[PDB]
Design an enzyme around this catalytic site. Structure first.
Site, PDB file in Angstrom:
ATOM      1  N   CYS A   1       0.653  -1.249  -0.137  1.00 41.98           N
ATOM      2  CA  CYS A   1      -0.115   0.012   0.013  1.00 41.98           C
ATOM      3  C   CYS A   1       0.769   1.364   0.205  1.00 41.98           C
ATOM      4  O   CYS A   1       0.547   2.205  -0.876  1.00 41.98           O
ATOM      5  CB  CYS A   1      -0.824   0.016   1.228  1.00 41.98           C
ATOM      6  SG  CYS A   1      -1.717   1.691   1.650  1.00 41.98           S
TER       7      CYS A   1
ATOM      8  N   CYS B   1      -0.397   2.318   4.115  1.00 42.43           N
ATOM      9  CA  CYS B   1      -0.713   1.277   5.002  1.00 42.43           C
ATOM     10  C   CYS B   1       0.001   0.339   5.902  1.00 42.43           C
ATOM     11  O   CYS B   1      -0.223  -0.162   6.640  1.00 42.43           O
ATOM     12  CB  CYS B   1      -2.003   0.355   4.040  1.00 42.43           C
ATOM     13  SG  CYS B   1      -3.132   1.196   3.248  1.00 42.43           S
TER      14      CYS B   1
END
Length: 121
Positions: A37, A40
């Site tokens: 990500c 993330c």
């Protein structure tokens, strides 16, 4: 080591999530993130800390910090940004509570207290 056997870290798969989330006896928090990500990757380590902290508190049988990747099967979760947070309160479940944006565990705990009844009043 345990790395979850203690309670902080919990697994949530398509065949399991449905159970924990539907469990009105206890509150569950399933967060969807990804390693590649980029934004993330921090959500992972941040969830491990809050998990051991909240788990140590006096709410072991009240709220459980569950983590999971948003790349599983049989998981109809449409969101704008990867860092998605699904809130499932005990007793008032049945509706996937989608957050607006993650950043810090401090914001997660607070919200759960506003939406979750177990972490309120």
């Amino acid at each position: 080591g345990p790395l979850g056997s203690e309670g902080p870290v919990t697994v949530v798969v398509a065949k399991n999530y449905n159970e924990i989330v539907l469990d009105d006896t206890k509150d569950v928090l399933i967060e969807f993130y990804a390693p590649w990500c980029g934004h993330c990757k921090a959500l992972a380590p941040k969830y491990e800390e809050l998990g051991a902290l909240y788990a140590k508190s006096e709410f072991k049988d009240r709220v459980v910090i569950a983590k999971v990747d948003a790349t599983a099967n049989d998981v109809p979760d449409e969101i704008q940004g990867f860092p998605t947070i699904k809130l499932y309160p005990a007793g008032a479940k049945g509706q996937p509570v989608t957050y607006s944006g993650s950043r810090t565990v401090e914001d997660l705990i607070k919200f759960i207290a506003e939406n979750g009844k177990y972490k309120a009043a």
